[PDB]
Protein backbone atom coordinates (compact mmCIF):
# COMPACT_ATOMS: atom_id res chain seq x y z
CA UNK A 1 0.00 0.00 0.00
CA UNK A 2 0.99 3.66 -0.27
CA UNK A 3 2.32 5.38 2.84
CA UNK A 4 1.91 9.12 3.30
CA UNK A 5 3.57 11.15 6.06
CA UNK A 6 1.33 13.35 8.19
CA UNK A 7 3.08 16.40 9.62
CA UNK A 8 1.61 17.95 12.74
CA UNK A 9 2.26 21.37 14.25
CA UNK A 10 3.63 19.68 17.37
CA UNK A 11 6.59 18.57 15.23
CA UNK A 12 5.40 15.04 14.52
CA UNK A 13 5.62 12.82 11.46
CA UNK A 14 3.01 10.07 11.50
CA UNK A 15 2.89 7.30 8.90
CA UNK A 16 -0.42 6.97 7.06
CA UNK A 17 -1.18 3.77 5.16
CA UNK A 18 -3.52 4.63 2.29
CA UNK A 19 -4.94 2.41 -0.44
CA UNK A 20 -4.62 3.47 -4.08
CA UNK A 21 -8.30 3.20 -5.04
CA UNK A 22 -9.94 4.16 -1.75
CA UNK A 23 -11.66 7.54 -1.57
CA UNK A 24 -9.72 10.01 0.57
CA UNK A 25 -13.10 10.82 2.13
CA UNK A 26 -12.84 7.63 4.17
CA UNK A 27 -9.18 8.20 5.05
CA UNK A 28 -9.84 11.76 6.23
CA UNK A 29 -12.82 10.95 8.49
CA UNK A 30 -11.24 7.84 9.99
CA UNK A 31 -8.04 9.73 10.78
CA UNK A 32 -10.03 12.42 12.59
CA UNK A 33 -11.53 9.66 14.72
CA UNK A 34 -8.04 8.38 15.53
CA UNK A 35 -7.15 11.92 16.61
CA UNK A 36 -10.21 12.05 18.83
CA UNK A 37 -12.09 14.81 17.04
CA UNK A 38 -15.05 14.96 14.60
CA UNK A 39 -14.55 15.42 10.87
CA UNK A 40 -14.39 18.87 9.21
CA UNK A 41 -12.49 20.13 12.25
CA UNK A 42 -9.13 19.67 10.56
CA UNK A 43 -8.05 20.51 7.03
CA UNK A 44 -5.67 18.33 5.05
CA UNK A 45 -3.21 20.29 2.93
CA UNK A 46 -1.34 18.80 0.00
CA UNK A 47 1.14 21.11 -1.73
CA UNK A 48 -0.84 23.99 -0.26
CA UNK A 49 -4.18 22.89 -1.68
CA UNK A 50 -6.80 21.36 0.59
CA UNK A 51 -7.56 17.70 -0.03
CA UNK A 52 -11.21 17.42 -0.97
CA UNK A 53 -13.32 14.55 0.33
CA UNK A 54 -14.09 13.52 -3.25
CA UNK A 55 -10.39 13.05 -4.04
CA UNK A 56 -8.21 9.98 -4.53
CA UNK A 57 -4.42 9.32 -4.39
CA UNK A 58 -4.58 8.66 -8.14
CA UNK A 59 -5.05 12.35 -8.85
CA UNK A 60 -3.00 15.34 -7.63
CA UNK A 61 0.12 13.20 -7.87
CA UNK A 62 0.42 11.40 -4.56
CA UNK A 63 3.50 9.23 -4.19
CA UNK A 64 5.13 7.02 -1.57
CA UNK A 65 6.75 8.86 1.35
CA UNK A 66 4.67 11.91 0.47
CA UNK A 67 4.04 14.77 2.87
CA UNK A 68 0.59 15.86 4.00
CA UNK A 69 -0.13 18.68 6.43
CA UNK A 70 -3.04 18.95 8.86
CA UNK A 71 -4.35 22.11 10.53
CA UNK A 72 -7.39 23.06 12.59
CA UNK A 73 -10.22 24.96 10.93
CA UNK A 74 -11.23 28.32 12.42
CA UNK A 75 -14.82 27.14 12.84
CA UNK A 76 -13.64 24.12 14.79
CA UNK A 77 -15.80 21.78 12.77
Amino acid sequence: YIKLKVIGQDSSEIHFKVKMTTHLKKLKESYCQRQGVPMNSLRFLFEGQRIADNHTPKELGMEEEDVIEVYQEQTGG
Binding site: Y1, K3, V6, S12, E13, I14, H15, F16, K17, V18, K19, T22, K26, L27, S30, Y31, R34
Partner: peptide, 14 residues
Protein backbone atom coordinates in the same frame (compact mmCIF):
# COMPACT_ATOMS: atom_id res chain seq x y z
CA UNK B 1 9.42 3.90 13.91
CA UNK B 2 6.23 5.95 13.94
CA UNK B 3 2.91 4.08 13.88
CA UNK B 4 1.30 3.77 10.48
CA UNK B 5 -2.39 4.57 10.42
CA UNK B 6 -3.98 1.41 9.06
CA UNK B 7 -7.15 2.44 7.29
CA UNK B 8 -6.67 0.52 4.08
CA UNK B 9 -9.68 -1.52 2.98
CA UNK B 10 -8.30 -5.00 3.63
CA UNK B 11 -8.55 -5.91 7.29
CA UNK B 12 -11.65 -5.12 9.33
CA UNK B 13 -10.16 -2.50 11.65
CA UNK B 14 -12.50 0.47 11.19
Amino acid sequence: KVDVIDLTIESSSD
